Structure formats: C-alpha cells, structure tokens
Amino acid sequence: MIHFGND
Amino acid sequence: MIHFGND
Amino acid sequence: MIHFGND
Amino acid sequence: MIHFGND
Amino acid sequence: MIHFGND
Amino acid sequence: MIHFGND
Amino acid sequence: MIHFGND
Amino acid sequence: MIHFGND
Amino acid sequence: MIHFGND
Amino acid sequence: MIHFGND
C-alpha cells in the first residue's frame, strides 16, 4: 500500500 | 492499494 | 484499488 | 476499483 | 479549484 | 471548479 | 487549490 | 495549495 | 507500505 | 503549501 495523506 | 488523501 | 480523495 | 472523489 | 485525479 | 477524473 | 493525484 | 501525490 | 503524512 | 509525496 501507498498512502499520500494523514491518518 | 493507493490512497491520495486523508483518512 | 485506487482512491483519489478523502475518506 | 477506482474512485475519484470523497467517501 | 479541487482536482481528484491525475494530470 | 471541481474535477473528478483525469486530465 | 487541492490536488489528490499525481502530476 | 495542498498536493497529495507525486510531481 | 509507504506513508507520506502524519499518523 | 503542503506536499505529501515525492518531487
């Protein structure tokens, strides 16, 4: 997985 | 998965 | 899956 | 699936 | 402007 | 403007 | 401006 | 501006 | 996994 | 500006 952004 | 954005 | 946007 | 937009 | 998607 | 989609 | 996605 | 994604 | 952003 | 991602 790749996440660009805040949790 | 790829997520561009906040959770 | 690919998501452009916020949850 | 591909989603352009917010949940 | 708001863009959900690639350029 | 709001764009849901690729350019 | 807000951009969710790659350039 | 806010950018979620690569240039 | 790769995360660009805060938890 | 805020950038989540690589240049």
Swiss-Prot record, chains A, B, C, D, E, F, G, H, I, J:
Q: How is it modified after translation?
A: N-glycosylated.
Query: What's the domain of life for this entry?
Result: Eukaryota
| Tissue specificity field | Highly expressed in the brain, lung, kidney and heart. Expressed at low levels in the liver and spleen.
Q: State the compartments where it is located.
A: Cell membrane; Golgi apparatus
What did gene disruption experiments reveal?
No visible phenotype. Mice develop chronic demyelinating polyneuropathy after 60 weeks. Mice show abnormally low iron levels throughout the body, and are mildly anemic. Iron accumulates in duodenum enterocytes, suggesting impaired transport from the intestine to the blood. Mice deficient for both Prnd and Prnp have the same phenotype as mice lacking Prnd; they are born at the expected Mendelian rate and appear grossly normal and healthy. Females are fertile, but males deficient for both Prnd and Prnp are sterile, in spite of normal mating behavior.
- Associated disorder: Found in high quantity in the brain of humans and animals infected with degenerative neurological diseases such as kuru, Creutzfeldt-Jakob disease (CJD), Gerstmann-Straussler syndrome (GSS), scrapie, bovine spongiform encephalopathy (BSE), transmissible mink encephalopathy (TME), etc.
As for family, the record states: Belongs to the prion family.
What is the role of the protein in this entry? Its primary physiological function is unclear. May play a role in neuronal development and synaptic plasticity. May be required for neuronal myelin sheath maintenance. May promote myelin homeostasis through acting as an agonist for ADGRG6 receptor. May play a role in iron uptake and iron homeostasis. Soluble oligomers are toxic to cultured neuroblastoma cells and induce apoptosis (in vitro). Association with GPC1 (via its heparan sulfate chains) targets PRNP to lipid rafts. Also provides Cu(2+) or Zn(2+) for the ascorbate-mediated GPC1 deaminase degradation of its heparan sulfate side chains.
Query: Which proteins does it associate with, and in what oligomeric form?
Result: Monomer and homodimer. Has a tendency to aggregate into amyloid fibrils containing a cross-beta spine, formed by a steric zipper of superposed beta-strands. Soluble oligomers may represent an intermediate stage on the path to fibril formation. Copper binding may promote oligomerization. Interacts with GRB2, APP, ERI3/PRNPIP and SYN1. Mislocalized cytosolically exposed PrP interacts with MGRN1; this interaction alters MGRN1 subcellular location and causes lysosomal enlargement. Interacts with APP. Interacts with KIAA1191. Interacts with ADGRG6.
Its domain comment says: The normal, monomeric form has a mainly alpha-helical structure. The disease-associated, protease-resistant form forms amyloid fibrils containing a cross-beta spine, formed by a steric zipper of superposed beta-strands. Disease mutations may favor intermolecular contacts via short beta strands, and may thereby trigger oligomerization.
Protein name listed in UniProt: Major prion protein
Question: What's the encoding gene here?
Answer: Prnp
Which part of the complete sequence is present?
Answer: 137 to 143 of 254
